[PDB]
Amino acid sequence: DALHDQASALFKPIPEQVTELRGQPISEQQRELGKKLFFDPRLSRSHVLSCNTCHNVGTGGADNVPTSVGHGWQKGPRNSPTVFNAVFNAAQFWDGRAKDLGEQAKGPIQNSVEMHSTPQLVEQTLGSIPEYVDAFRKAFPKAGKPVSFDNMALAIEAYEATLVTPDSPFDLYLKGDDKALDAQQKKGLKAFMDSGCSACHNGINLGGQAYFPFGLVKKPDASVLPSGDKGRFAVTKTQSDEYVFRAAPLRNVALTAPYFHSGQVWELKDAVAIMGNAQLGKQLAPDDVENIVAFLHSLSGKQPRVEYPLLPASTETTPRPAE
Amino acid sequence: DALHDQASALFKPIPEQVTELRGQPISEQQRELGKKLFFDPRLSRSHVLSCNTCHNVGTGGADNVPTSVGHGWQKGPRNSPTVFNAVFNAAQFWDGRAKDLGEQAKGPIQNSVEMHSTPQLVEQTLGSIPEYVDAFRKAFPKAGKPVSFDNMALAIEAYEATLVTPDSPFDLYLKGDDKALDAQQKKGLKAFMDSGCSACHNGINLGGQAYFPFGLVKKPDASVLPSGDKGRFAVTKTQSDEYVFRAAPLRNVALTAPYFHSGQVWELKDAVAIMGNAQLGKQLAPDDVENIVAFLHSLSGKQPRVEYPLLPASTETTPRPAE
Ligand code: HEC
Ligand code: HEC
Ligand code: HEC
Ligand code: HEC
Ligand SMILES: [Ca+2]
Ligand SMILES: [Ca+2]
């Protein structure tokens, strides 16, 4: 039917797995090292924060707090997005300031309000542990310096690239199952398309591919759009980039409240309404709103099964937790 | 041989699993619910602390920081012990104030320097998520009030009870593999028993069953025994309990540095020496110390394989992160 044709020209399902990146097999030695690294809180200076702290794999890959709490209980400027499906995004972070997951991982380690570490500290910590030395050596066989900050970032990337959420009701619908969307979700899917939401939220991720003003038509209030965060401007210094953000990828959006970069909006219904007004100049009917919320619930996929990694013991030369 | 017979008289292996508790079967449903609760940060006021935060399953079931960092980054008075094998200990906590895991679990929830929450906030939180309501109704089918604070604690205990670490090289040895300990370990074991470490550190957990002064003979250094933490004296208000702590169970001690209730001691060789002097009045020879450290490494068991739980989404009526 028509609705199916229309959706199929706009969206793509999440693949059942990702095993390739930039045209090469993901190394599984690298995938398994990256998994240890993602959960190792010793990548942080305090030894109390891992990537999983802010990107909890049990709660949609996000920490679901307005803005993340990092080193010294410092809350950041932004809501942490999910790491799930992040490989398919055209760039990383709310302002697209990282090309890929490899480059992205370097931010958190060094960010004083997140992990508050350095390249040297990381290298020294990982190199102090024989199991890590051996795992880096094997995962990076052509390297004269297998244990390094850049290779740590590559391993984490390899792991994250695998963290995808296939077979959401919407994907099963895309792939051929007409009844995977209930009648409400089909109305919501329709409302989403016809209102123009899909102009910014399209493809594999329903967003993450381009940057737009938060307020293409009308600026949200100052709590939803804090004046102190100019988004893309901070990257490009082009003035028309003030308050321009990456279109948020909508996969698993039901699982990652609160919403927008600012984490101020707890209800999905309110996020949908704010988006009609801000981006489309359209006050959505109560029905469109509820039906779009329903459709967004169809976006939540099979959560990846994470077996908690065993991390190797610290040794005598392992740096100690500090401030 | 004689060494083996001497060891069999004082020590017992960790069982392969635990399926019973207080003469009753552990319900799978309680166990599975307990795992969800153990990992759910929404049991903390801030939504950023779970049990796993301070009792990390990846790093021996302890945070491996001197004293735990909790709500608002407040450092506690004490080092967090492992939750592994904690079921076998006569009482819980360094001062034995909780009878068992169920009673223990309520402590961290309400501790201002840890989770900073309340039974009322927990119940509001669990009651607000339909998956949790259902799961309690099925886990606690004989309760007038399935979703309760008491039941939360009983669920956590049922999960924790199952986190055991069997088949450490010591336990393989006990069970009849005479080669599971190498020659240095054999010597360490011999020194351990003969010096009288085993008077306080015995049975299943090599400790955990009885309370002794830290400094039965000589008072340790005040770095290891800060004057503001008086152990059981706070529990009982009995003067003779000043600086009395539970004999530490030694299972996985190699994996859980730093050491003692205060977490000031990062090297097991230094922990062993302090124990010798303080408890036995003996300056152990560097060689005996090296050997006993090697024996202590034999107490590292097979770590539990934990599948990270999928935690159900917050709703409109789930309490928001605060302080
Ligand atoms: C350990 C090295 C990691 C890794 C691999 C990732 N994180 Fe974070 N994260 C946090 C916040 C607030 C953001 C958004 C900040 C901004 O946009 O300026 C992020 C962002 C990410 C991404 C981007 C994904 C996307 O869809 O844009 C990725 C892939 C990512 N992170 C991975 C918050 C935190 C923390 C708070 C204290 C910590 C710790 C981490 N992140 C750690 C890591
Ligand atoms: C571009 C002109 C857009 C159109 C039209 C719509 N959306 Fe959007 N969306 C866009 C951006 C640039 C952002 C990020 C804004 C920010 O700085 O936070 C978003 C975000 C959302 C969200 C929240 C996602 C999250 O926090 O993870 C939702 C729920 C959302 N958008 C939905 C939505 C709807 C329902 C729309 C049509 C009615 C719609 N968007 C249009 C870009 C654009
Ligand atoms: C830090 C912010 C913690 C939180 C979160 C949790 N625990 Fe904890 N735990 C912590 C400390 C500092 C201590 C020792 C405190 C003392 O006065 O003795 C503990 C103790 C336990 C124990 C005792 C085990 C033993 O060998 O004595 C257990 C079984 C335990 N904690 C379990 C537990 C649970 C189930 C938690 C989630 C509700 C939890 N802890 C959180 C530090 C912190
Ligand atoms: C009773 C009189 C004891 C004898 C004899 C020995 N130990 Fe002990 N041990 C005892 C107590 C009361 C405690 C806890 C002290 C505190 O307040 O922290 C301990 C603790 C240990 C530890 C620390 C384990 C950890 O922090 O996880 C170790 C490594 C240890 N004990 C080893 C040990 C050795 C090698 C002994 C023979 C020299 C020895 N203990 C004797 C009680 C008693
Ligand atoms: Ca969010
Ligand atoms: Ca310890």
Side-chain angles (χ1 to χ4, degrees), chain B residues 230-309:
Chain B
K230 296 202 180 309
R232 306 246 328 135
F233 181 75
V235 183
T236 57
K237 320 289 166 73
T238 291
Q239 175 53 47
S240 60
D241 275 347
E242 188 178 52
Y243 306 121
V244 171
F245 298 86
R246 188 187 69 172
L250 294 179
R251 295 291 185 179
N252 309 288
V253 66
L255 303 185
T256 56
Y259 299 114
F260 300 126
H261 65 278
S262 45
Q264 298 307 290
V265 177
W266 282 91
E267 300 303 320
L268 207 34
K269 78 198 170 186
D270 298 312
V272 172
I274 288 149
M275 269 293 108
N277 281 134
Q279 307 302 64
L280 298 171
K282 215 189 154 234
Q283 253 284 21
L284 288 153
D287 205 59
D288 299 333
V289 174
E290 285 182 35
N291 302 332
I292 284 168
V293 169
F295 161 73
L296 298 191
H297 280 253
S298 76
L299 313 171
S300 298
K302 308 181 171 157
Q303 311 287 286
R305 300 176 88 87
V306 177
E307 200 173 61
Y308 211 112

Side-chain angles (χ1 to χ4, degrees), chain A residues 105-267:
Chain A
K106 294 180 193 165
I109 280 96
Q110 308 179 84
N111 192 328
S112 85
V113 307
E114 299 175 1
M115 296 176 101
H116 194 11
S117 185
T118 60
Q120 165 164 301
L121 190 63
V122 153
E123 290 183 0
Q124 174 176 349
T125 304
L126 297 171
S128 75
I129 297 152
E131 294 92 327
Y132 269 132
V133 166
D134 172 82
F136 275 96
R137 281 168 75 100
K138 276 149 175 190
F140 299 98
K142 295 288 168 259
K145 192 179 173 184
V147 171
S148 77
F149 187 65
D150 294 335
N151 289 342
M152 175 236 257
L154 293 175
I156 286 169
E157 167 163 58
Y159 172 62
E160 287 187 297
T162 59
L163 296 178
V164 293
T165 60
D167 301 333
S168 63
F170 183 60
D171 277 5
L172 298 184
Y173 167 80
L174 254 31
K175 286 184 280 195
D177 177 5
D178 190 71
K179 291 159 164 181
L181 292 181
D182 74 18
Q184 184 171 31
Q185 298 177 316
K186 293 183 170 162
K187 278 155 175 292
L189 155 68
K190 201 140 209 313
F192 189 94
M193 292 194 293
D194 289 350
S195 313
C197 307
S198 59
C200 304
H201 305 283
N202 49 71
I204 294 200
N205 274 354
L206 294 83
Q209 296 315 290
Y211 315 105
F212 302 97
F214 188 3
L216 180 56
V217 178
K218 317 186 157 162
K219 213 165 189 197
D221 97 330
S223 85
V224 181
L225 193 52
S227 65
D229 190 323
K230 348 289 166 175
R232 267 307 258 198
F233 176 87
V235 174
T236 66
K237 303 167 201 181
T238 309
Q239 187 256 286
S240 53
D241 277 338
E242 264 174 44
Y243 309 122
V244 171
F245 294 80
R246 182 192 69 175
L250 289 185
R251 301 285 188 181
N252 304 300
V253 65
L255 309 177
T256 62
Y259 304 109
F260 316 113
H261 66 271
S262 44
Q264 293 304 299
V265 168
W266 283 94
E267 297 316 297

Side-chain angles (χ1 to χ4, degrees), chain B residues 47-67:
Chain B
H47 288 12
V48 307
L49 307 164
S50 65
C51 310
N52 191 65
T53 299
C54 298
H55 296 284
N56 192 318
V57 302
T59 66
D63 50 21
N64 287 350
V65 126
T67 65

